[model samples]
Target: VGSLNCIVAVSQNMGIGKNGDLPWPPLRNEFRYFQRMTTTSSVEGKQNLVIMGKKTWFSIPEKNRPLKGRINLVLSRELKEPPQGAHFLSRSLDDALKLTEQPELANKVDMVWIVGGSSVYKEAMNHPGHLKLFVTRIMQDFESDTFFPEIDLEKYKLLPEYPGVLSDVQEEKGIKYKFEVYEKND
Candidate 1:
């Protein structure tokens, strides 16, 4: 099995969105950070697998669909075929993991990243193979109808340092944030 992880940005109150999109305006640097995390791979020629729920898939602009250089997989039972830009469609997280675990496919996938929508996050977090969480802590709050699932700090220990992850707080357009990685200790 490949290392499964999650990546998300949450506000002070754990709010991740309002309506169908982010509550605040886009932050250029944060977006760049997201692109870098999803696309980067430890194995030189391998790529990362990004599995996001269908709603999350459509929330992305058409221009940024497929997220270049990354293998996009959308989890949806309603889809008979892959979406316009996604490379694969899985009915369940188990099916997604099984697909990537195939010998031929395993070598091509360095990491399995769970990108948003509440159900997916909850399922992945409770999965046996989940390894790390790449969470961006947004220092401010805004109106939000959707909030990130409660994270158990005791289960995930915050790392003082992680290679390639910045430890300093970043500010953009008056919004402040920091990149944090929580590794499973048990």
Candidate 2:
């Protein structure tokens, strides 16, 4: 297993809009932002899947239904399937992981990045076991109480990272950030 992995982005309005209180989807392009951030762009022809909570799915832009270079899956306890361009799965976080490890997806997933709302991220990150995390820190003074779960720092060691800003379609000053990869400490 490469890593029992996930990616998280709660607020995207300059990290927070002074009044943004970390809503279910964190009003903004946060859904697309998280999904896009996890993808390894420079790796050449590499692709992965994005697992997200239902709230996150609804928050995503309709025209951007089919996420590029990724199999977009929504984690809902009930579902049929998304539109023609997307897919769905009915299970908790662990079940999704099981599906990802299936031989078909296992080999294809260069990385299974869970791009999401706080609920999914909290459940997966604090599920009482070993989980690898790749955290990106944006130098924004977000005053909102909504935050990523307190991961056990002892259980992980930050791998090398590409530090700088993230220049996305929604950003102008390139949203200063750093890509930090981490895996199990042991």
Candidate 3:
């Protein structure tokens, strides 16, 4: 089975979005980190799979739809098919995970990354599997409608540091943040 991972950015209150978009200004450096994590593959000729809910999919700019260099899976029961630029459509996160395990995809996918809205994040967090969370902790608070779910400290242990992740706090546009990794404790 493939490991399930999540990549998200949240404010001090765990808020992720405001009015269907990011509450804070663009964090170019953070975005770059996201792109690098999802696109880089350890296995030659393999790519990662990024799964997101319908709202998250649409939240991305039309010009950047499908999120190049990686396999994009959109979850939507209402939508009949994948929107323009999306590779596949699944009814739910489980369906999307199953798709990645299928013969056609199992060999092609290097990792499964969940990038999403509130509900999707909740589901991924509760799923029983090898899970790793790549969280960007924004030190500032923002007015937001959507938020990342609370992490269960007993189940997940926050790592002291991870390779390729900066240990010190970072600043962008006067906003301070830090990268943190939490892995499921066996």
For candidate 2, give the lDDT. 0.59
Model 1, span 90-156: residue lDDT tens: 9999999899977867789998899898889988888774479999999998888887898888788
Q: On a 0 to 100 scale, what is the lDDT of residue 14 in model 2? A: 28
Q: Candidate 3, residues 7-85: lDDT per residue as tens digits?
A: 9999999899997799899999999999998888778888899999999999998888889999999999999999999
TM-score of 2: 0.65
**Residue 122's C-alpha lDDT in candidate 2?**
73
Cα error, residue 185 of model 2, in Å, equals 4.1
- Candidate order (TM-score): 3, 1, 2
The whole-model C-alpha lDDT of candidate 3 against the native structure comes to 0.91
TM-scores of the candidates are 0.95, 0.65, 0.97
Number of the predicted model whose lDDT against the real structure is largest: 3
Model 3 spans > 4 angstroms off: none
RMSD of each: 1.3, 5.6, 1.0
Q: Which candidate number maximizes TM-score?
A: 3
| lDDT for each residue of candidate 2 in 1-186, tens digit (9 for 90 to 100) | 344577654233323212333323242444445555666543445567778777666655677666776777788776766645666574688877787777866666666676665678777776665566656555455555445666566776766543432433233244444445566634
Q: CA shift at 102, candidate 1, in angstroms?
A: 2.0
